[PDB]
Amino acid sequence: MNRVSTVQQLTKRFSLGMLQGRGPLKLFMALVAFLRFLTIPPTAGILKRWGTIKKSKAINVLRGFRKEIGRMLNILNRRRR
Amino acid sequence: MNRVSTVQQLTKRFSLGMLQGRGPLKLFMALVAFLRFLTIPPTAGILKRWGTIKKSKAINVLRGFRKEIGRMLNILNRRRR
Amino acid sequence: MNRVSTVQQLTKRFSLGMLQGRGPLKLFMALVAFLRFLTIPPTAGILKRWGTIKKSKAINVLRGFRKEIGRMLNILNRRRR
Amino acid sequence: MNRVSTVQQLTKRFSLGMLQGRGPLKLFMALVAFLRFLTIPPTAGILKRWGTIKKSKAINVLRGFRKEIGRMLNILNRRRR
Numbered sequence: 661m662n663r664v665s666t667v668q669q670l671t672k673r674f675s676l677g678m679l680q681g682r683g684p685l686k687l688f689m690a691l692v693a694f695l696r697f698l699t700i701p702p703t704a705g706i707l708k709r710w711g712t713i714k715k716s717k718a719i720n721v722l723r724g725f726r727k728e729i730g731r732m733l734n735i736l737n738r739r740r741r
Numbered sequence: 742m743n744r745v746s747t748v749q750q751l752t753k754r755f756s757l758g759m760l761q762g763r764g765p766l767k768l769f770m771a772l773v774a775f776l777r778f779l780t781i782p783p784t785a786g787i788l789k790r791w792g793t794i795k796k797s798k799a800i801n802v803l804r805g806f807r808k809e810i811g812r813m814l815n816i817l818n819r820r821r822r
Numbered sequence: 823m824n825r826v827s828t829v830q831q832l833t834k835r836f837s838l839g840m841l842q843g844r845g846p847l848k849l850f851m852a853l854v855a856f857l858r859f860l861t862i863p864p865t866a867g868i869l870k871r872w873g874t875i876k877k878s879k880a881i882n883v884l885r886g887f888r889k890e891i892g893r894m895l896n897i898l899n900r901r902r903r
Numbered sequence: 904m905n906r907v908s909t910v911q912q913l914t915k916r917f918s919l920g921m922l923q924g925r926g927p928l929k930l931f932m933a934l935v936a937f938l939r940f941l942t943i944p945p946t947a948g949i950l951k952r953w954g955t956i957k958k959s960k961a962i963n964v965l966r967g968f969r970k971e972i973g974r975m976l977n978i979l980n981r982r983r984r
């Protein structure tokens with residue numbers, strides 16, 4: 661039903677608060693990964709929350725991210741030869 | 742100081758055009774990974790660039806991101822809780 | 823109760839859609855006035871809606887804006903001598 | 904073409920810092936007028952700049968804005984509906 665977002669829909673979803681480390685743990689961890697991929701320093705709010713996340717839950721989320729990059733690599737590899 | 746970004750600095754860097762698939766390949770790929778991590782549908786402009794991506798360069802970028810997820814697991818491994 | 827906004831509160835209120843000419847008539851007219859004050863060209867969406875607004879209602883809103891600039895001038899004049 | 908702005912162009916021009924009271928006096932005064940038109944409370948940074956404004960320059964800017972409201976009334980006067 662909803663396979664494509666509009667730019668307006670994404671701006672509605674990605675509020676300024678997430679840049680201060682607000683939001684669901686999965687959103688926060690995805691944003692930290694995004695900044696680290698780009699070597700962009702975190703905000704004070706992101707660094708504060710980075711210190712308080714639960715080790716085991718954060719590790720579980722990151723294993724999921726590692727798998728998802730694997731899925732993306734499978735799509736691109738299966739596209740060329 | 743370049744250990745922390747201001748929210749102002751991040752809003753400046755992450756211009757609206759990146760939601761239409763504009764920018765350096767590393768920025769584009771980091772955004773695509775971020776959206777896939779969160780199961781957020783891409784925009785038409787993101788999907789068009791995904792479809793026409795230089796596959797070898799994109800694979801190299803994603804391999805680097807996967808190494809960075811490993812580095813994030815290694816940071817969290819050191820914690821007691 | 824609410825005499826001051828946070829930056830986050832204002833970003834919540836001022837969605838991307840208003841730059842496309844979406845929103846209450848008063849919001850739209852305030853934005854058109856803001857752009858005209860700065861001699862910034864409108865977007866296609868703003869120019870589209872500018873053509874469809876009701877003359878008498880739009881004029882009423884603008885008379886209110888004219889009065890409000892008068893109130894602001896009264897505050898600044900009463901501050902110096 | 905400089906008869907229309909893109910939404911992208913406007914997001915570029917209207918940086919987050921202006922919500923903290925940063926920018927050219929004309930930009931600051933246009934934003935203060937816009938918020939007052941809509942009865943939206945200012946931020947602490949906007950209020951601080953309002954309190955310390957160069958009153959003569961600010962009055963000159965607002966007189967120009969009031970002339971522009973007149974020009975907008977003159978445009979709408981010409982319409983049949």
Ligand SMILES: Nc1c(C(=O)Nc2nnc(-c3ccccc3)s2)sc2nc3c(cc12)CCCCC3
Nearest residue numbers: 670671674755756757759836837838841914917
């Ligand atoms: N530019 C963005 C956004 C954006 O510009 N949102 C805006 N919302 N309102 C805006 C605005 C700006 C000026 C006037 C009126 C409204 S811009 S949201 C967003 N989310 C992401 C990105 C960018 C933006 C890319 C970085 C990865 C996180 C996801």
Ligand SMILES: Nc1c(C(=O)Nc2nnc(-c3ccccc3)s2)sc2nc3c(cc12)CCCCC3
Nearest residue numbers: 674675676679752755832833836917918919921
């Ligand atoms: N920058 C603004 C806004 C803004 O940056 N909103 C954002 N919302 N989400 C953003 C974002 C950006 C990147 C990543 C995640 C979230 S920026 S809203 C807004 N509203 C006004 C102005 C600016 C902004 C000034 C012009 C007069 C209209 C009122």
